[PDB]
């Protein structure tokens, strides 16, 4: 995995919106191959992350050749207090379980929800550290 971005002069890997804020210490991401939890991640640290393969740019890694360095990026709403998945012109596209997302337009992410990126057939189950 390398980076040979020659397009344009120099561009970032994402652009945090203005609806982004700060998530409380009680959130965390997840992944499901279908009916089995693969791994788990945290999302209660920043207000916007990434999702591709190259960590040198993104914070996470889809772990798929199909995907791209910056397949997409997440964003934690503030006025909604939820999450969002911005399909950064994903090679294929991003979905929210059974919904399709635009390659630019963000799509909120409910708790115990499920999202499926282009290749990664996973079912990113966005959870939320409930009551103990």
């Amino acid at each position: 995995m390398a980076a040979a971005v020659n397009s344009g002069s120099s561009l970032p890997l994402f652009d945090c919106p203005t609806w982004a804020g700060k998530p409380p210490p009680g959130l965390h991401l997840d992944v499901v191959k279908g009916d089995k939890l693969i791994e788990k991640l945290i999302i209660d640290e920043k207000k916007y992350y990434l999702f591709g393969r190259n960590p040198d740019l993104c914070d996470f890694t889809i772990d798929h050749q199909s995907c791209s360095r910056v397949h997409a990026a997440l964003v934690y709403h503030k006025h909604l207090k939820r999450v969002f998945l911005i399909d950064l012109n994903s090679t294929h596209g991003t979905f929210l379980g059974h919904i399709r997302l635009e390659p630019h337009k963000p799509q909120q992410i409910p708790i115990d929800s499920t999202v499926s990126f282009g290749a990664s057939t996973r079912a990113y189950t966005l959870r939320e550290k409930p009551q103990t």
Side-chain angles (χ1 to χ4, degrees):
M1 305 158 119
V5 300
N6 72 326
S7 192
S9 35
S10 45
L11 294 297
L13 30 288
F14 165 80
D15 204 7
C16 170
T18 193
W19 33 275
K22 248 88 97 54
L27 309 164
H28 70 290
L29 208 266
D30 321 58
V31 175
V32 203
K33 62 94 78 158
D35 290 76
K36 153 170 96 165
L37 191 299
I38 303 293
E39 74 207 307
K40 215 187 319 179
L41 330 154
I42 288 56
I43 50 104
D44 58 24
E45 330 207 68
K46 43 64 251 207
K47 97 289 300 199
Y48 102 68
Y49 261 142
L50 293 100
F51 262 109
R53 348 174 296 202
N54 234 125
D56 177 300
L57 342 166
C58 305
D59 247 283
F60 277 14
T61 36
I62 310 183
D63 200 334
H64 218 316
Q65 84 184 274
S66 266
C67 306
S68 320
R69 287 93 150 187
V70 203
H71 181 124
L74 169 162
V75 178
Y76 185 82
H77 220 282
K78 75 200 296 148
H79 324 272
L80 304 186
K81 293 91 71 91
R82 350 170 138 284
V83 176
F84 271 86
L85 175 25
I86 333 201
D87 174 292
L88 306 193
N89 29 111
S90 167
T91 148
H92 330 265
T94 308
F95 270 63
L96 178 46
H98 93 258
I99 312 174
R100 79 95 52 88
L101 333 178
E102 316 245 327
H104 261 304
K105 314 214 308 166
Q107 159 54 44
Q108 111 183 46
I109 318 285
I111 312 307
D112 279 62
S113 173
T114 300
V115 357
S116 87
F117 279 46
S120 25
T121 45
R122 305 317 184 71
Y124 291 4
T125 284
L126 169 275
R127 231 73 77 87
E128 161 166 286
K129 297 194 51 45
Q131 211 98 143
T132 58

